[PDB]
Structures are given as C-alpha cells and as structure tokens.
Design a binder for this molecule. Sequence first.
Ligand SMILES: Cc1cn([C@H]2C[C@H](O)[C@@H](COP(=O)(O)OP(=O)(O)O[C@H]3O[C@H](C)[C@@H](O)[C@H](N)[C@H]3O)O2)c(=O)[nH]c1=O
Ligand SMILES: Cc1cn([C@H]2C[C@H](O)[C@@H](COP(=O)(O)OP(=O)(O)O[C@H]3O[C@H](C)[C@@H](O)[C@H](N)[C@H]3O)O2)c(=O)[nH]c1=O
Ligand SMILES: Nc1nc(=O)c2c([nH]1)NC[C@@H](CNc1ccc(C(=O)N[C@@H](CCC(=O)O)C(=O)O)cc1)N2C=O
Ligand SMILES: Nc1nc(=O)c2c([nH]1)NC[C@@H](CNc1ccc(C(=O)N[C@@H](CCC(=O)O)C(=O)O)cc1)N2C=O
Ligand SMILES: [Cl-]
Ligand SMILES: [Cl-]
Ligand SMILES: [Cl-]
Ligand SMILES: [Cl-]
Ligand SMILES: [Cl-]
Ligand SMILES: [Cl-]
Ligand SMILES: [K+]
Ligand SMILES: [K+]
Ligand code: NA
Ligand code: NA
Ligand code: NA
Ligand code: NA
Ligand code: NA
Ligand code: NA
Ligand code: NA
Ligand code: NA
Lengths: 397, 397
Amino acid sequence: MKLIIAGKNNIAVDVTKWIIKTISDIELYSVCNENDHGNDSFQLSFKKFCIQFNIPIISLEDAYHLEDAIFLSLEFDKIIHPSKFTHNRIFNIHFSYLPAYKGMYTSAWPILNNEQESGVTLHKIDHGIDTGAIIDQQKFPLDIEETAKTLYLKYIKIGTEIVIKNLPALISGNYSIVEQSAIKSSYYSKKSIDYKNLMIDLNKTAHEILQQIRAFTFRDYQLPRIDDIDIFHGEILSSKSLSKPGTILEKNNYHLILSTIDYDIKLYSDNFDEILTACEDKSPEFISKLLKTENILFEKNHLGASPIIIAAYHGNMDVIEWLVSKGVNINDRNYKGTTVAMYFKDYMLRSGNYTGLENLINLGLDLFLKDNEGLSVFDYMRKNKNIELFNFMSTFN
Amino acid sequence: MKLIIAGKNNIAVDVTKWIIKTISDIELYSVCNENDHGNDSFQLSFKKFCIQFNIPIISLEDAYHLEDAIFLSLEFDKIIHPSKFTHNRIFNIHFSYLPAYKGMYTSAWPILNNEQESGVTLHKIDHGIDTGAIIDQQKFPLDIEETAKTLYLKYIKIGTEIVIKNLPALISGNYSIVEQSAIKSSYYSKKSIDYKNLMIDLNKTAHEILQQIRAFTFRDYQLPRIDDIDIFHGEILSSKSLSKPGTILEKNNYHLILSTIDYDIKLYSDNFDEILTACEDKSPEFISKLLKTENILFEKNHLGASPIIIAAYHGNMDVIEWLVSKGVNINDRNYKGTTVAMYFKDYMLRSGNYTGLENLINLGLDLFLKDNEGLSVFDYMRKNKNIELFNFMSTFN
Ligand SMILES: Cc1cn([C@H]2C[C@H](O)[C@@H](COP(=O)(O)OP(=O)(O)O[C@H]3O[C@H](C)[C@@H](O)[C@H](N)[C@H]3O)O2)c(=O)[nH]c1=O
Ligand SMILES: Cc1cn([C@H]2C[C@H](O)[C@@H](COP(=O)(O)OP(=O)(O)O[C@H]3O[C@H](C)[C@@H](O)[C@H](N)[C@H]3O)O2)c(=O)[nH]c1=O
Ligand SMILES: Nc1nc(=O)c2c([nH]1)NC[C@@H](CNc1ccc(C(=O)N[C@@H](CCC(=O)O)C(=O)O)cc1)N2C=O
Ligand SMILES: Nc1nc(=O)c2c([nH]1)NC[C@@H](CNc1ccc(C(=O)N[C@@H](CCC(=O)O)C(=O)O)cc1)N2C=O
Ligand SMILES: [Cl-]
Ligand SMILES: [Cl-]
Ligand SMILES: [Cl-]
Ligand SMILES: [Cl-]
Ligand SMILES: [Cl-]
Ligand SMILES: [Cl-]
Ligand SMILES: [K+]
Ligand SMILES: [K+]
Ligand code: NA
Ligand code: NA
Ligand code: NA
Ligand code: NA
Ligand code: NA
Ligand code: NA
Ligand code: NA
Ligand code: NA
C-alpha cells in the first residue's frame, strides 16, 4: 500500500519520520509545496528531508494516477479535487477546530476574535475549502499572551500528534466520520489580512489593540510596527487619556504609550537583539531589567539562536541557570537541531573550562540528542579529535 | 430638584412618562437630538412629545448651566463632557452589556459576531465613548433569527425598564458604581458599517452570510439586497454546490439560491406588500403558503400597519384568529398608537356586521387602550356620534 504525504514543515517531516519508524510495509511518496525550495527555516524543508531520506518526490498530477494509495495533506498549498482520484482515501489536517476557521491565517484570526480556545482537525478532503467530514479533532486553550507564532507551533505539535494517533485507522479504513455542521462554521480568505501592509486599528479599545498586536506577532514573518517602532508585546495601563485614540502620549527607545478608546496602552519596543548580546556576558540581574516582557526570553533569531543558546556558547553559567528557572528548555535547539549541549561543548573546548558541565547535567542537559544531520555531540568530538573533552563528557550518566 | 432628559425615541418618551406619573416633585427639562424634527416614525418623536406635554426643551449648552440637576442621556446624539457641569450626576443608558460593544451599531455587531447574548447598561458619563463606571446592567439571549430591528426593540424595552428601576437611586444618590474592566472591552465606530453602501460578503459560509443578512434586516431603514432583490430572511440548505461562493444557482420571484463556502443558502425575497394585501380578504391557508418565513407575520409598514391591523380593518376574522394563534398581539398598534380594536370598530361601522367582536374579546381584545392622542375607541365613537355601535361595544366586560 502506498502513502502519499503532500505538504510542508515539521508536521510533514515528523509524520513522515513516524511512518518510517513504525510502518515499514508502506511505500512512501512526497508531494511538496511550490514555495518549498529546499531551505530550512523556523520549520524544516520537507523537500530537503525527502531527498535526504530517499522518499520519492512526485507531482500532484502523478499522485492522481497512483492506485492503491492513501493521500494525506499537511499544510499543502494546492487545491485537491476528490474527483481526480480512483479512491476516497484522501485526508487533511486543518489548523482549527472545524467547522470554525476554515481557510486562511488560522494562527491570527482566533486571536483577533478573542477566542478562548482553538484546535486541530483531521478530516476528509472534499471539493471545497476545509469542508469535508471530520475524522478526529482536539482542542486547547489560548494563553493570555498567545501570539500567532506560539499558536502556530501548538498547531504543528497537536496536528502531528493527531495524525500519528489516527494513521493506523486511516490505513485500515476503520475510522468514523461526521459531517461538519453549518452552525458556527466560519471562513477567512487570503484577502482578510494584508500581511504586506498590515495596519493596526488604533481607534479601538486597549484590549482590541493588544489582541491585534499579539495576532500579528510572528518574528520569522513580522513584528507589528507602530510609528516606525517594531513592537514586542505590551500592557494595558490604568490611566485613561482624553486625547483621540491613537495619540502618542510618550515615545522613547523603550516603548510607546498610546491613548485608546478606554485605557492607555504601553507597547514595548522589540529589544531582542540587545537581549541576545547581553546573554554573552551579562548577569541575570542585568538581563531582568533590560527585558520588558519575559516572552523575549523564548524568542529565536532567523537561525534559531535563543537567549539560552547564546549563554551556553559563551559559558554564561548564571544566565543559563536563570533561564532554566524561568522555564526555558535546557535542551533548546536552533533550526538545524544543534542543541544547548553542543554549544556548551564549544565553550568548554574554546576556554578549557570544564567545571560547569556537571551543574547543567543536574539541571537536565541531555548529551545524547542528535541534530538534523543525525549527529550527537560525541560524533562531533570524535570527528574533530577532541578526545580529552569527549572522555570528560562521557563520565556523566 | 431638576431632571434633564437628553435623547430620543420611546425610551426617552416612556421614561419621561413614568417620571410624570410617579415623581411629581421634579422639574423636567428636555434636550433633543439634531435629527428629531418632530415626526413620529417606528419610534415617537421626543420633541413632539415634550412640546405636547409642556416639558421645556433646552439646548445642551443650557443644560451645562443648570445647577441642582441630574442629567440622563437616552440615545442622545452629542458628546457630553463631565467637566462642563457643576456636578457629577450625569448618567447614560447604552445599548450593550458593557464593556463589550461600546460605540455604534450595537443592534448589528452582536449579530454579525454571532453572540449568544446582549444587554443594556446604565453607567456614569465620562469624557470618552461609553467608558464610565457601571451602575446597573441586564443581559438577555439573542434569538436564533434575531435581526437588528428585533434586537433594537429589546434594547428600547430593557433600557426603559432599567432606567425606571434605578431612577429613585439616581435621584437619592444612593447607588453603587464599578469601573469597567479593560478585558473583553470592544468598540465599533461609525466607519465600521456603511449603511449607504452595504455589501454582504458572499465569499463566506452559509451561517456567516445569514448572520449578515439578519444583522442588516431593519425594515424601517433597509433590507439587505442581493442581485437586485430585497431579502427577508433565508435558510441553510443541505446541498453543497461546487461553484464559486456567491454563484447564483437559482433566481425567481420567490428566492435566490447561492453557493457558499459550505452549504447552499436560500434567501427569501421580501413579499411583505403581498402579505398585507392578502390579509384584506384571503384565507389563513392562502397566507400560509404565500409567506416564506413566519417572521413576515410580525412586520410593519412605515405607518405601523401589520398583518393583523389589515385583517382587522377588513374584518377578516379567520386571519385575525390565525395570526393570534401564531403569537401575534391581538392588541397591536400602529405608530400613532391606533389599536386593533379601533381598526375592527371601523370595519363594524362600515359593514354593519357586529357579530365578530365577541370572539375577539374572548381572545383578549382590549377596548380600553388609548392611542398617542390619549383617546380610546369610545372617545372616537362618541365624537363621531356612532352611539348604537358605542353602546354595543360597551356591553363587553
Ligand atoms: C504569510 C504570513 C503568515 N503569518 C501567520 C498567520 C498564519 O496562520 C501562520 C502560518 O502561515 P502560513 O503557513 O503561510 O499560512 P496559513 O496559516 O494561512 O495556512 C493556509 O495556507 C496553507 C498552505 C494551507 O495548507 C493551510 N491549511 C491554510 O490555513 O503565520 C504571519 O504572521 N505573517 C505572514 O506574512
Ligand atoms: C443608521 C442605521 C442603523 N441601523 C441599525 C443599527 C443600529 O444599532 C440601530 C439603531 O440605529 P440608530 O439609533 O441610528 O444608531 P446606533 O444604534 O448606532 O446608536 C448610536 O448612536 C446614537 C445616537 C447613540 O446615542 C447610541 N448610544 C449609539 O450606539 O439600527 C440600520 O439597520 N440602518 C441604518 O441605516
Ligand atoms: N479541496 C481542497 N480544499 C482545501 O481547503 C485545501 C486543499 N484542497 N488542498 C490543500 C490546501 C489548499 N488551499 C488553497 C486555498 C486557496 C487557493 C487559491 O488559489 N485561492 C484563490 C482565492 C484566494 C483566497 O480567497 O484565499 C486564489 O486566487 O489564490 C489555493 C489553495 N487546502 C487546505 O489547506
Ligand atoms: N462623553 C460621551 N460619550 C458618549 O459615548 C456619548 C455621549 N457623551 N453623549 C451621547 C452619545 C454621543 N455619541 C457620539 C459619538 C460620536 C460622535 C462623533 O462626532 N464622532 C466622530 C467620529 C465618528 C465615529 O467614529 O463614530 C464624528 O466625526 O462623527 C458624536 C457623538 N454618547 C453615547 O451614546
Ligand atoms: Cl506554502
Ligand atoms: Cl568538537
Ligand atoms: Cl584531545
Ligand atoms: Cl439621532
Ligand atoms: Cl367612530
Ligand atoms: Cl348611532
Ligand atoms: K483615551
Ligand atoms: K459552495
Ligand atoms: Na522551511
Ligand atoms: Na472519527
Ligand atoms: Na493576505
Ligand atoms: Na523588566
Ligand atoms: Na421618530
Ligand atoms: Na450599582
Ligand atoms: Na457608517
Ligand atoms: Na410557507
């Protein structure tokens, strides 16, 4: 039996990995998105992965002709018409709790509309947009400071889990379906948000504006920009200016304060670059006063470098420990899968200071992770003939 | 103590009536809206009422200078600045459950946003838009086929009741306040809907389109118009056309059927004029097949004439009884307060057929209501020297 995975990003990669691991009786095929040109970013290129793992890449037109197959879309970019296949084993993951939020921008709209929850849905593909019957779905709450990025990452994670949970049933044909209700069905088109001329409506309440701010916060794509300042989170003040909504009450390097329909708002300028630099050699005290929101402690640059990665590469031990205490992952990775341990190893090698490792191991540092090339820190130390450091690191269980 | 009532419509009229009835120790003043030019419509002119009841009409500028006063806005049209008064006894009724739906078009927005409920709020006036502290509020559910008109009428009714309930406390100064929360505060401006170029977004789900249809249904102002057809309600079909959303699948004198993102919709053309004509002399059977929604049975023309009024004026007895059985008010009135009984009297007079009255009295017909001029059916029969009919009608308790 053939399984065609059509789509992109870590959902398509991780689903495909689980299949390779778990279901060896299956002949796998890939259909990729037009904009996937082989470059990893915040999400892995499914194209690059398939080529490296010897998964044959086929066109959509080819997939139509494959008989004895299941077809599974995961953030795929082309409309699929059920009529064009010999069979009805055509499945999709959509990033909403259907029937709500059919269509586009499902990491923004629920936030813009102040939903309490969202979810992910596995359903049949039918001819229309996210209209087909439901096989399974899972819901989750939206956090108070949820952004489009944090939301999208929850969708990737939950979607991957729902596919793996259901795939044996999709394969066996032993699943149930329920037609989507018309009631509380909703849809947004690509015209509904112009990401290339995004404007925040300031003639609104504090809460409405901060909803918009957070819905448009997705660092890899954009930050919201107000009065020529990139914004990273904000807060609602207790003051209530009489000035027209949108009036700039205060503007400095740190923030803007605006009048709204109700309560004044304070919008924090983005200082992520400054946070990264500070993590090289400054104290947790210093950093705690530089940041305006603790959200900034979990941000990543275009390579995936985070505060804790920088701290680790520079052997800034007090900052590593402090970040961990704020809930940062001691085993964080950049976008190539390089781990905190690998960066810390670099510091040990460069400095000759091995004394900090034990502390990190006790805080949960995992030496046995593999990066996107399938190599561990040990594989690198061996390749580079850093045998003394290898052997030192090897003493930790 | 002085009480200034600033505003419009039946809220301002009915509140003022209760004051006249209940609180004779009070010196009343009126401030009217710029667009109130003395003409009754679906709502009474507050200007006309004040002139007839010898309530002095003053300017807003005059109201600022009145000391020892309370000021109460009821759908008033001009911004009131607390700074301009000697006192803080400045109160407003807003047609939403604040802090949600500050601003405009509160009979449409909750429907457009598929709210479960709305409400009315009595609050202090502060300098901004519907921002001041809450004194009281009441909530209610939205009906499944709620329209902007039905909603607005609930607001008028509930608002009037909340003012009367609270007015003794406003007068005594013995009320409590709570500041409005920032959370779930929302606002819409006059730019948010263009009633002079209203377009229904058809590239949406069946449910989204019917939400829009109903939010824009307010006969005195407009009906929604699609493909040059005025629409009065619709329904969601079980069919699901593949054609682009908004495609007209069928168009005839009765309805349009459109493709949507999900389920096809059927939008009923408005046939209210035909319903009114039918009520002159056609059977309930006939009328039941002419209507496409029972909502049409409760509609009124620009004078306030309804199906039951027409039936009564024409002595269409089977239609009167049938309408009552569908929940129509046997004591319905036009916009001048003329009642079903008054119209039925006209039929009796014209025809000489007195036989139907007893039936209507047993169904709840009230002979003792007064119109907007303060006259009953008896007052008219006496004035017109229709003594035989007067005396006949007088036998019913
Ligand atoms: C293009 C874009 C997107 N975003 C946000 C909002 C969006 O929900 C999230 C992920 O973006 P994406 O994967 O381009 O597009 P979207 O979520 O609309 O996904 C849609 O298109 C894809 C290809 C379909 O398979 C999917 N089912 C659709 O929902 O990132 C931004 O913040 N800025 C952007 O410029
Ligand atoms: C002008 C207009 C209104 N409507 C609907 C929607 C609106 O909520 C309802 C009553 O209209 P209205 O009283 O002009 O205006 P609105 O409800 O926006 O009230 C607003 O303005 C008045 C003067 C303020 O005191 C009030 N607090 C505001 O909410 O009728 C229509 O369907 N068509 C229209 O053309
Ligand atoms: N049948 C089907 N339904 C879907 O919802 C769907 C699939 N297939 N396949 C994968 C993905 C494809 N989604 C889309 C959505 C819109 C356009 C498109 O070309 N739209 C028009 C209109 C723009 C808009 O309103 O969004 C365009 O001109 O771009 C293409 C692919 N998708 C589910 O994820
Ligand atoms: N202080 C105060 N707040 C209010 O919300 C309020 C009052 N007073 N008095 C009665 C009524 C007045 N509402 C309004 C609202 C807007 C405009 C006005 O002129 N607005 C601008 C902007 C348009 C818009 O965005 O709606 C305009 O140019 O028309 C006037 C009166 N109103 C509460 O009912
Ligand atoms: Cl894409
Ligand atoms: Cl090494
Ligand atoms: Cl060595
Ligand atoms: Cl007005
Ligand atoms: Cl008479
Ligand atoms: Cl007589
Ligand atoms: K303000
Ligand atoms: K359709
Ligand atoms: Na990528
Ligand atoms: Na199922
Ligand atoms: Na767009
Ligand atoms: Na801080
Ligand atoms: Na009027
Ligand atoms: Na109170
Ligand atoms: Na408008
Ligand atoms: Na009918």
